[PDB]
Symmetry: D2
Subunit: 259 residues, 4 copies
């Protein structure tokens, strides 16, 4: 397939619904060799089982809480014992404390909630780019992250995650501008709403889903298969002319203003 010979590290698998799972499946289908991180020991077993079904194995699964620089560096040190280089990093991770995402933005947003949202959802992408730079050197590889329309325009409850996604998208451009000379491309998919574990935590998520379904040009919601294909493409040599890009996979909802 169009990723044959590529090696990809995938950060963010939590369940069969995860966007990272859609990306993993597509990349494997297209021939990529895969490795994984898991956030903690409660998710470890499930990620290990998933890896075994995507051509991978438990010894290519590594612990990584992206709050922790030491753990992030330890991923690449461990991976480097198995692989003499790396082509792709997929960053499919986000978090803000629940109290940040339930209520009036001004009332509920706090300094610490803000700190955490930006640290986990935006800085962690830079952290992976940094720690993986040496393994990716000379491979003309790519980095991919995931964003959401909330970075550009507002909706109830998404709140400070919108600020963190805006930070993240700027990061995509600054990373592209920095890593491009040595051959690395850096892009994101901005997905439409998809029912995932994380999506469940936004109390009004179903309203986002509904608005997208009724107003998006395709008049249906997107799938992790569609996000995965877009991500697979962006991390392939087919996309070698594309860097710094935020690619929407939302049926075109972002191009509408039918409020």
């Amino acid at each position: 397939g169009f990723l044959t010979g590529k090696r990809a590290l995938i950060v963010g698998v939590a369940s069969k619904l995860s966007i990272a799972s859609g990306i993993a499946a597509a990349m494997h289908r297209e021939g990529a060799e895969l490795a994984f991180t898991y956030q903690n020991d409660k998710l470890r077993g499930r990620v290990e089982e998933f890896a075994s079904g995507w051509g991978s194995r438990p010894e290519l699964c590594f612990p990584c809480d992206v709050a922790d620089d030491s753990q992030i560096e330890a991923v690449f040190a461990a991976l480097g014992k198995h692989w003499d280089g790396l082509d792709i990093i997929v960053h499919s991770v986000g978090f803000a404390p629940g109290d940040q995402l339930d209520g009036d933005f001004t009332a509920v947003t706090t300094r610490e909630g803000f700190r955490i949202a930006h640290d986990i959802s935006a800085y962690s992408f830079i952290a992976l780019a940094k720690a993986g730079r040496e393994m990716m050197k000379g491979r003309n590889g790519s980095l991919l992250t995931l964003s959401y329309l909330g970075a550009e325009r507002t909706m109830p409850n998404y709140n400070v995650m919108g600020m963190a996604k805006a930070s993240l998208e700027a990061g995509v451009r600054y990373l592209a501008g920095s890593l491009g000379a040595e051959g690395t491309r850096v892009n994101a998919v901005s997905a439409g709403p998809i029912r995932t574990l994380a999506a469940s935590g936004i109390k009004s998520f179903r309203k986002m889903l509904a608005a997208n379904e009724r107003q998006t040009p395709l008049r249906r919601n997107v799938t992790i298969e569609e996000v995965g294909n877009a991500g697979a493409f962006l991390c392939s040599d087919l996309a070698s002319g594309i860097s710094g890009e935020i690619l929407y996979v939302d049926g075109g909802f972002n191009t509408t203003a039918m409020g």
Copy 2:
């Protein structure tokens, strides 16, 4: 490849250098069956030649000056006698009278120059969408056009083509909003500068090339192979979640405000 089973109409091949040629080659490589238009008889011979190299033939090549509604409609009438229906239309066509793109925007832009630029570069995409709607019904296919950063931000000489491209990009969105419910996706690639017949017509194009090479994140100009691959992907079922999109294939130049120190 990821287009085997699809049928595409390619509008805009002029030479081996054309972006439409890069797209045609990628789509052919990926398994698409191709048909072609040529602007007029000055380009017929070359388009027929190229088509035969891309799995196609002269009887799947049709005259089409996109200023002319009846020529446009006659393409699909003629094509529909060979093809059941149609999955893909690639719109890779632009024009403004030469004097519109040489000198101060305010001084050289005219009503007639404006009319023509918008008619050929923007309305013609809508015309193809309309004329091909019947052949594309039920096929869950897609439309692709080509744009340039000049639509969003200014540079010397691009001038009224910048207005026409802005119109075109809005057109992508209005077409996507109109045709999506029945299954058709509508997108564009906004390409970085590439040496083509039309590009060579722009004074200071050489400088645009040098500017991009120095300042673009990838520190190199893009190719019609790279634009071709992006266009092929957008018109494939791999992109079934994507409509209304303006996808930049420019190495990231559009994301920069200044070049390196």
Copy 3:
């Protein structure tokens, strides 16, 4: 006020509801001396009447169908026998054939509907810039046009006016890039929906109004007084650092993707 000493030409007054009327009233309040155009003799009487209420007079009112270059040029020739120079032009004009704005975009949009929409709604701003350039020479003045969110994102029925507005907004940028060196600033206000004569022609306009009221951050529709004030500011020396800008006066509606729960 902050416009005392300035002279402004206002194109687009039709009724007391017009955006151009809100702009005219605000500029008059702030001390500007005003001149006016009227599209044709159907609006001459009301425009002359309104002008006399804004410190002006029939002799500073001129016929101008912006489809017609010779009429446009005759405005400035005639005005120049009263005024030795001009600081400001306000361009508050739009048109597309009615059937272009009623129904499915792909089905109802035509080449001729497209031509007219872009000719009147977009090129005419360029035409004013060109024709008034001599009179604005050395005055460090400004141009203002009016746009709508439909240029960037889609909604029912706005259709080809959305393409024309996108063209116009690029026009703002290219004019700014061309005329800035000699001192002229060029901007637009992108207004939220307002009940005007033209707006009343759009079916489902009442839905656009209700949509904005519920979803806009300020939870209320905007007024021609608010648009008028923003336009007055943009055309004043208070805004001397501002050119090429599309300023939204829509209560923030454009910054929202969904309304409140």
Copy 4:
């Protein structure tokens, strides 16, 4: 003038060159009653002297390190002793550690430098909005912050400040969406490059100045007088139809690609 009867708190005066000083001068000219904060006791004296010349006085100057929630709350507590309400808050501050802004983005950006840049340059705007909400209640007032093109497109060395500004501009929109119903408008000016104390800290600032000068439509750089007039306008009832907006005052540079 068009701010007569308005009371404004201005956060960010450091010297006669400050953007905040340009905004203060314009607002005072237009009739606003002003109060001020100062970052530390080194700047206290200078801010006090400036206040006296802008119709204000030393007792309307308050300490505020915007890293500190209690100090921020203490500003409004103290100001409330003097004013029974507040109309305007101007947020004109930023900071990132110098090592973040000198060199390759991927190489020099760190988790802590990221945290600080976002905390001081972005979250602090939300903090002021929150702390001032009661004093602003029912006055149909406004909030203003300052941003920079670096939020949208990249340039050498601006680096993580670009991410922080992108966060800030999303903040402008989320605040607008939250505070609008009760009558508060929220906007920013995105200024072109201006020689200020903070600007001099960016190693390549003169290259930014030069690019703006040669490529901006007006072919000259903007002044704090021009930024202050725009900010004064945005915080006036003349701008009562405008919220959630990022108003560029850069001579049009942002609209150019080659210029």
